[model samples]
Target: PIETVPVKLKPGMDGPKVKQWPLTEEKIKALVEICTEMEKEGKISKIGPENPYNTPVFAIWRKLVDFRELNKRTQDFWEVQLGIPHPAGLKKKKSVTVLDVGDAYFSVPLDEDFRKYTAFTIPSINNETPGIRYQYNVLPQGWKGSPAIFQSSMTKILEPFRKQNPDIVIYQYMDDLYVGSDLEIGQHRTKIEELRQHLLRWGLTTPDKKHQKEPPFLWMGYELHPDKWTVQPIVLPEKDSWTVNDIQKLVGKLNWASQIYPGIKVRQLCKLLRGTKALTEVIPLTEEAELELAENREILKEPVHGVYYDPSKDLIAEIQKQGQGQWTYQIYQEPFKNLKTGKYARMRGAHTNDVKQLTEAVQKITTESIVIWGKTPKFKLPIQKETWETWWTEYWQATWIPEWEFVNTPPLVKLWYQLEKEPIVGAETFYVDAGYVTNRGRQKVVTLTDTTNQKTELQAIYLALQDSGLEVNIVTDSQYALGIIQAQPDQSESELVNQIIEQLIKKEKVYLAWVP
Candidate 1:
């Protein structure tokens, strides 16, 4: 048996009292003492878990997120409303909402004498006040699966009416139904009537009191802006700014509106909020940064028109925490320009191929090793800029940056200096910070360019670091540079870089820096 709290609005008498099991004599004595004191205060009866009511209802709703599986007839409606292109990928996006009246069902349980009740997930009222409990059920703000199932089933019941009013958009999820037509109010009214009748045919009864007649109602936990035809997450008044935890909480919240919202801002904010040790001091969007915030509204806003509603399909990989200031990738030899001067260099294939404008760059560090840069140097790259961009785009994270940002930076300057050392045919370049260079394919050490401005600067710095016994580590945004610094250059052309690191190791030096 269950009991309700009294009319006086006090804490319920049937709260729980927890204690460890396998009670020892001492433990029992202590518990008994506590119970005795509670009994004296007339509070001993409410010391264990008990059902709050005799009848309990476990409402049922299932979820389907595969965006492609949404009813075919209604796809265009949702696609236009959310501004997402038609299905382009394998899985269809899905969002869950509370029950829509048109999609909801209410049933009373029958005893074992009823065969139908056995198949249903029967619950005890499992409360005595039938409609009161029903009202409470519809009013409570819980239940995650109710919305999708409601929308799905309700769409079927509304099918006949939909065919009659082809221009109308009628959406229902569980217990909430949104009926409207591009047609006038009178026509929309007729459409709603026919829609509800089909719902009744399916035995999914809805109450008039519970069935809101408002032009737009809050259903599936979102206030469907019928005019706008978009869903928005209901804001809780208690919070102001969103936290990283909140960002994660809202990940799937906009599944229905992903077509309507880019989710970029939200993702950026979440990435900022994740607070993982690896992600250090990532500032949230400042007001200035908001200018870059891909034209999205916090509320009462629609997503940018014409942008495709596609979620990020790739897992963005960042540097590991332990290897924070590191970069790595395949290296290519730049033979297009002279190592000593920025003049064009040429290459000849082993076979009967004519001379090709060589982009292969190499830096020789020693007689035994040389550093090389090329995607597939063994093979040939077309001498066009577009092909180079496309090929590099596949390997590099971000290739395009302001010209000034690239040339003026110290690490970039140092890397350019290193690239002028020598030209290896097909050795991989690697860099870590930039203190060491290794080439696995070097037959000779590469020689640094005599007159390059970068080489001149590095020469001066080399003397300074040597005098102080402090070698400055190269920090760079270039994946090529990072790989070059890290790789053990083996080619004969990388011998020049090999000599520099050898000299550094012979004389102890300090070199460490960041690359972003």
Candidate 2:
């Protein structure tokens, strides 16, 4: 441990880096100018008084509306319009009821500027922190409350419907709503329209283009993922080469999503995080699971592998700020590499106190053993297949198996299939792939390498595995993949990972997943 090689931030590291609050001179100038203007108005270093909204009055008025009364009205509306007997006529007959809420998120980005104004008022009678705040809180894009708030609002609007259709059970999330009915299509549609009218009466207008007349559309945010949950990019792709700036922006987007992807797996997604595709999956991480990523960091920290891979700060900050569970690393605790003598190494360490010191020291040795045989890699020119193999052989080979059995099948076949499908084309066409596929329950797990395009070809082999009628437990580093079933318990995103892990660990016969 005392003989560890050290890493210092490279001087003048060039390129657009992680997103931070802008701190340029121009920004500082604007801030200073604003502060100066405030001083001139005699408001500098000042606090303000609070004026609370009359929530009690609002609550009382709401109570007067009577949700039960509103529910009865909704049932009456449905019975009259749909020509169905009212709940009173049904006489306590239980029937199927579905509520669909679709596409829920933290408040839709404000469509217009919002501010609180105080005029002819005492500004600082009591010491209070006050300023014009954004209309909505700075909630994460997908928050637990997004759906709840929307559902509450829906409940209020449909108060009459609830009372009328006591037999109809309602469940709601953000933008998605599912209404189950033992009634026919015509009945459902008619009742739904009636509900829509009630919502309109409450001053909540559904956008004509966005609102669906269809039965399966997401309401506030809950529905079957196939028809409801989908990825939508901010911008569409142009038929041209992507700029480095485009990649940089994509990196920012993926970094935000990394809170859901843990371990080194998300690092692979960073390579795929580009503007070319719509709705790329967001792999997330838990605080404890992030340690699994450090293993993939460069063995040689120089120009040969110029970029240093680490846990994204945005990911760490988001997890620390929003996550509720304790961090753990039991699932993926292996070192990035095994050691060889005469090689220098260093590690950033792990997220948990339980990480093995031996694992860290060994992985460090494996990374340091990569060599150029000279000061500059330029003389090395294009790295040959053998040269790459030589490095792996000399340093990483001891840990490398020609082919290992996973689930009674060789997982390397999957890698070969993935690689063979699309050969790497150029510097710009890059991919980061990692996964473990098993045939039998207790087989070894292997990692896959990069494959940017040519996925069609590799996909054939993946299909072949399934086609062969052999059960495969495949845990991939592809962020685009959906329905990856695992049992991850560390973070919010682990729900999907956990499902995928359960499938793998349980040696299930069918493919199931919890998507990113």
Best by lDDT: 1
* Clash statistics: count for each candidate: 88, 73
Q: What's the C-alpha lDDT at position 368 in model 1? A: 8
Task: Report the backbone clash tally of model 1.
Answer: 88
lDDT of 2 by residue, 397-504 (tens): 143311111222111111001111122222111121222233332222234455443342234224323332324323334443421111111122323333333333
Minimum summed lDDT over a 10-residue window in model 2 is located at 313-322
Residue 467's lDDT within candidate 2 is: 31
| TM-score per candidate | 0.31, 0.23
Find the candidate with the highest TM-score and give its number: 1
Residues 1-516, candidate 1: write the lDDT tens digits.
011111111133321122112333444345445434534533222211222221122212321112111112111211212222121111111211122353242221111221111111121222452221111112012222223333444555566677866666544423444554445556655555655566666555544525435633343343333332334343322234545454445433433343333332333434445444432332455453343233333531542221111233221111111111111111112332111111111222211111011222211111101111111112222223443343344433333311111112112201111221232334333222213233432122234555454343333323333433222433334444234433322221333444444544443333333357
**Cα RMSD (Å) between model 1 and the true structure?**
20.4
lDDT against the true structure, each candidate: 0.30, 0.28
